[PDB]
Amino acid sequence: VLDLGALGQDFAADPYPTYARLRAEGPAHRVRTPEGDEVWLVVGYDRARAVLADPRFSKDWRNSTTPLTEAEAALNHNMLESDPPRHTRLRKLVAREFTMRRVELLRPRVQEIVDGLVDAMLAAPDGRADLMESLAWPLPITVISELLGVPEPDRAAFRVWTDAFVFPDDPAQAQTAMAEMSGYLSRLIDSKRGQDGEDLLSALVRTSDEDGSRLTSEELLGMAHILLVAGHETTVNLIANGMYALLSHPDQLAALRADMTLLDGAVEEMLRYEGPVESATYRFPVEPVDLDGTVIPAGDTVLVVLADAHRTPERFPDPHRFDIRRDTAGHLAFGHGIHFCIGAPLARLEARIAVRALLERCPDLALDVSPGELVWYPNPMIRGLKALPIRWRR
Ligand code: HEM
């Protein structure tokens, strides 16, 4: 068993080599996460892709031998942690709210939000700021919060809770954060009841109250939680990671600035090259599964290392090169199969508007920190930065 925690920040900063060595030996490996969790890592583009859509790997905890704490159990009734027929019903309930068609209608508002955030950031007295604090975090939380009716003054709280989840300074920290959030969400849900809010949460509350068969009280909390959390944490990191890749690759940045029609393709490469989801969410084999000779017992935790699939030479030639014009068709940054990120259209909209706004309004935009000064999350599931200092005055 490889102890990833023993590799320290060197692993967090650059985990790809480790993932590659493992892929060379086999598709599945038992590892010890920095958090102390003993789990399985599935590496290799082909294998990764197959497992993601393989019904033998359930996402329903009833098939997991790992116990759910009280706090975790309260939020566990969501589409992501479910298999059909439950998953099918939960997702269909809100699928229409997130199609590209619907999401496109949000462009004017997303533009407003970005414009305002950029206006505030560029007013910095010394032409310096942290992109994470000034844009990466604020944008996604604002968008999903307006959709789900989370009052603006309560938004800063999710960042605190997210930090407690991502890089918990203590196991209990994560749990306390989950209980707080769960309580906040239940109260918010309550405050919506009876009122005629036009936001999605209010709509969901109504649906739940009118027909508990379509959405039980527990599935209601589960939905509020997954949509709000998955609704911004990864987007925040895509924006920061992507802008970091771009600004740290002079020729790619110059290429994009020279032909902004390459913007959409650049965002795709950011997803492929430095996607926010290093490893997919927990999967549990219903029955023992044999992967090219290795047998993962039923009930064990399995993480499909998307980060490694994206560095597989066979699918992405010269994988370590950040190439905005590269062919990225079929990458797994948004997953694969029935769980394919329901927020992909929205994420792409947010990321594209943010990156375009920074380039078009900040011609002298540059990094204001050195690689060694950057702090990456050790969690094998999250690829992200603690902060991203930038400047725009040469
Ligand atoms: C650029 C950022 C994004 C990335 C890379 C991302 C990535 C992913 C991935 C890889 C999965 C599936 C993981 C697995 O199979 O275990 C997923 C699921 C999900 N994501 Fe995202 N996501 C992003 C943005 C969003 C946004 C904006 C929302 C907001 C609606 C969202 C909502 C969800 C939900 C609700 C699921 C569950 C889908 C299901 O189980 O059917 N995601 N996301």
- Which residues have a Cβ under 8 Å from the Cβ of 1 and sit 6 or more positions away? 30, 31, 32, 38
Those residues whose C-beta lies under 8 Å from the C-beta of residue 259, and which sit 6 or more positions away, are: none
| Residue where the block lists tokens 């527990």 | 218
Tell me how far apart the alpha carbons of residues 60 and 309 are, in angstroms, rounded to a whole number: 24
- Per DSSP, the three-state class of 80 is coil
Number of domains in the chain: 1
Tokens of 328: 């990225």
Q: Which amino acid is at 386?
A: K
Method: X-ray
Report how far Cα 230 is from the mean position of its chain's Cα atoms. 6
Q: How far is the CA of 125 from the centre of ligand 1 (A)?
A: 37
Helix (H), strand (E), coil (C) string for 289-324:
EEECCEEECCCCCEEECHHHHCCCCCCCCCCCCCCC
Alpha carbon 3 to chain centroid distance? 24
Residue 106 belongs to domain with CATH number: 1.10.630.10
> Known binder of ligand: residue 13?
no
* Residue entry with tokens 């994206």: 310
Question: Which whole-number Å values give the CA distances from 268 to 47, 190, 271, 355, 386, in the listed order?
Answer: 22, 39, 5, 12, 22
| Contact indicator for 204, 221 with CB cutoff of 8 Å | no
Strand, coil or helix: 40? strand
Distance between CA 23 and CA 42 in Å, rounded?
8
Cα separation, 15 vs 9, in Å, equals: 9
Q: Give the pocket of ligand 1 (CB within 6 Å).
A: 52, 79-80, 91, 98, 144, 226-227, 230-231, 234-235, 238, 275-277, 280-281, 333-335, 339, 341-343, 346-347
77 is in an annotated binding site: no
Give the range of the structural domain holding residue 200, as residue numbers without chain letter: 1-394
Angstrom CA distances, 65 to 30, 44, 287, stand at 16, 26, 12
| CA nearest neighbour of 200 among 103, 107, 82 | 103
Q: Please tell me whether the peptide bond between 85 and the residue prior to it is cis, using omega within 30 degrees of 0.
A: yes
**Intra-chain end-to-end CA distance of the chain, in Å:** 49
Dihedral of alpha carbons 280, 286, 288, 289, sign: negative
Residue type, 26: G
Ligand 1 atom with the shortest distance to the CA of 91 = 41
Phi, psi of 295 (to 5 degrees): -105, 115
Helix H segments across the chain? 8-13, 16-25, 45-53, 70-75, 86-94, 100-104, 107-121, 131, 138-147, 156-166, 171-192, 200-210, 217-229, 233-247, 250-258, 263-274, 306-309, 344-361
State how far the alpha carbon of 26 is from the alpha carbons of 5, 22, 42, 289, in Å.
21, 6, 9, 14
Reference 225, options 196, 279, 189; nearest CA is: 189
